[PDB]
Amino acid sequence: SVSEIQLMHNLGKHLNSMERVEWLRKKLQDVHNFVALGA
């Protein structure tokens, strides 16, 4: 059985498990170069 087959096929269009964490990882770089370069 295969669960979330379309979720993995979206890889960025759905944003839930591995897609969401990738969006948050980029957000850490945006916050880093937003007001102060800390993290």
Residues in Cβ contact with 22 at an 8 Å cutoff, skipping those fewer than 6 apart: 12
Residue type, 26: K
Question: How far is Cα 12 from Cα 8, in angstroms, rounded to an integer?
Answer: 9
Query: How far apart, in whole angstroms, are the C-alpha atoms of residue 39 and residue 24?
Result: 13
H runs (alpha helix) in 1-39: 5-10, 18-32
DSSP category for residue 37 = -
Taken in order 18, 24, 26, 28, is the CA torsion positive or negative?
negative
Give the count of beta carbons closer than 10 Å to the beta carbon of residue 15: 15
Alpha-carbon torsion 9, 10, 11, 14, what sign?
Answer: negative
Using what technique was this structure determined? NMR
For residue 18, give every residue at least 6 positions away whose Cβ sits within 8 Å of its Cβ, in sequence order, or none: 8, 11
